[PDB]
Amino acid sequence: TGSINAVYFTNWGIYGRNFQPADLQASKILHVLYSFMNLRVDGTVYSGDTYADLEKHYSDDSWNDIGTNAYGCVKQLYKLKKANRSLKIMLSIGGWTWSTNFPAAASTEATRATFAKTAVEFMKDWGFDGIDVDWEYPASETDANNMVLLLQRVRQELDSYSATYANGYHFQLSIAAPAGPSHYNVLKLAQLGSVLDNINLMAYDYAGSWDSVSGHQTNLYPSTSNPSSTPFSTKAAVDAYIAAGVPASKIILGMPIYGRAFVGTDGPGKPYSTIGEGSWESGIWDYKVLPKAGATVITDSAAGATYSYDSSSRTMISYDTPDMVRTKVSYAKGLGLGGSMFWEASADKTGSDSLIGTALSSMGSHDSTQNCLSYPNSKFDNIKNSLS
Numbered sequence: 001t002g003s004i005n006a007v008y009f010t011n012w013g014i015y016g017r018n019f020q021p022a023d024l025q026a027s028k029i030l031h032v033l034y035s036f037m038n039l040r041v042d043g044t045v046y047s048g049d050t051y052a053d054l055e056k057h058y059s060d061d062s063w064n065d066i067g068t069n070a071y072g073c074v075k076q077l078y079k080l081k082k083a084n085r086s087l088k089i090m091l092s093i094g095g096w097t098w099s100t101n102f103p104a105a106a107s108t109e110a111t112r113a114t115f116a117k118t119a120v121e122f123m124k125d126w127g128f129d130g131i132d133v134d135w136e137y138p139a140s141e142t143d144a145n146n147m148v149l150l151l152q153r154v155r156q157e158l159d160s161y162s163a164t165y166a167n168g169y170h171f172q173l174s175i176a177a178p179a180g181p182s183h184y185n186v187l188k189l190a191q192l193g194s195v196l197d198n199i200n201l202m203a204y205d206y207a208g209s210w211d212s213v214s215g216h217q218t219n220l221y222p223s224t225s226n227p228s229s230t231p232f233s234t235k236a237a238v239d240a241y242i243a244a245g246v247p248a249s250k251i252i253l254g255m256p257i258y259g260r261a262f263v264g265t266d267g268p269g270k271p272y273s274t275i276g277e278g279s280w281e282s283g284i285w286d287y288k289v290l291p292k293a294g295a296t297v298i299t300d301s302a303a304g305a306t307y308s309y310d311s312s313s314r315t316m317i318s319y320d321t322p323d324m325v326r327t328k329v330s331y332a333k334g335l336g337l338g339g340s341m342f343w344e345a346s347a348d349k350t351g352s353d354s355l356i357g358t359a360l361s362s363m364g365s366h367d368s369t370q371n372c373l374s375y376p377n378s379k380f381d382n383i384k385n386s387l388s
């Protein structure tokens with residue numbers, strides 16, 4: 001019953017962004033994509049921040065617990081799982097920055113087995129509900145085939161783990177997927193659709209500093225009036241995936257909780273001086289600070305995009321408004337897509353202007369699939385006891 005509402009939570013969001021797991025709208029999210037784990041060329045998955053993942057003590061945490069115990073974001077997320085049964089926690093591996101070793105990690109039966117075995121080990125120790133593989137991106141036909149083999153080996157490991165320790169609980173397996181044809185045309189889409197529970201389409205980052213002209217970063221449709229503003233489109237991607245034999249219900253529509261800026265520009269599809277400053281890096285702004293004073297919010301209904309434009313500073317910021325999220329959900333419903341996904345949690349507004357909340361309101365009811373609260377093989381005593 002219901003729709004998927006998947007949200008990236010970054011483990012570095014606990015520093016400088018001061019965004020802790022407890023701040024999530026846990027009752028409005030069915031999948032937390034907990035990001036990221038790193039990996040070696042030999043397939044070994046590992047924590048890139050044990051402090052954030054496991055060791056940080058929140059005000060509730062004791063220093064003198066009996067045995068070996070999990071703290072950090074892991075314990076915090078598990079707390080949320082107990083209180084919100086539709087909340088699945090996914091172990092996200094790789095990502096934009098940590099995809100360099102994927103080709104090698106997927107390359108042999110031995111490396112794929114290591115990746116399986118180490119990934120599931122984290123899942124079963126940390127009390128998570130599945131694995132999300134974010135390989136950006138397979139380059140060759142060999143990589144594409146290896147990706148399928150890797151995912152099948154992970155599926156095998158999840159199934160065997162579950163038969164032994166989870167009474168057949170169906171742990172989940174997903175990927176972050178490209179909306180760029182140069183990348184999705186490499187993938188074995190039909191095979192991916194068969195093996196995976198969900199395919200989270202990264203329907204954003206269509207425009208930025210790498211473009212000669214400003215553009216819409218997350219538009220639904222090609223612009224016929226101003227095509228230089230739309231180098232990509234969600235529609236082309238979704239159509240390609242569905243035509244390939246990917247079940248629409250497994251496709252989850254990614255949406256940005258941030259804006260991409262073009263400073264010193266006449267508007268979409270123009271010349272721009274610089275991407276300018278940002279919230280945490282140049283040219284990217286947290287949704288929660290948009291729109292800025294002096295900027296007007298513009299809707300291009302034909303392209304299916306919103307953006308702010310400030311004509312005095314000649315600054316365009318490409319981002320999704322709540323009413324853009326509503327429009328996108330309506331598009332997704334028409335195609336029978338499985339739900340929504342967001343990058344990333346910390347930047348969202350509160351109350352009704354939350355993009356995460358807006359999406360769920362538009363979607364209707366939340367995915368009823370129950371999480372797992374039984375981890376009898378966890379090396380952490382508190383996790384094995386379900387924090388009871």
Ligand SMILES: Cn1c(=O)c2c(ncn2C)n(C)c1=O
Nearest residue numbers: 094095096097134176202343
């Ligand atoms: C760094 N990074 C990612 O790694 C990523 C993403 N969307 C999906 N992934 C995996 N976004 C927007 C991102 O900025």
Ligand SMILES: Cn1c(=O)c2c(ncn2C)n(C)c1=O
Nearest residue numbers: 096097136202204205206208
């Ligand atoms: C072009 N691009 C990026 O530049 C990017 C990203 N995620 C993070 N970054 C930085 N994605 C998904 C992306 O398509």
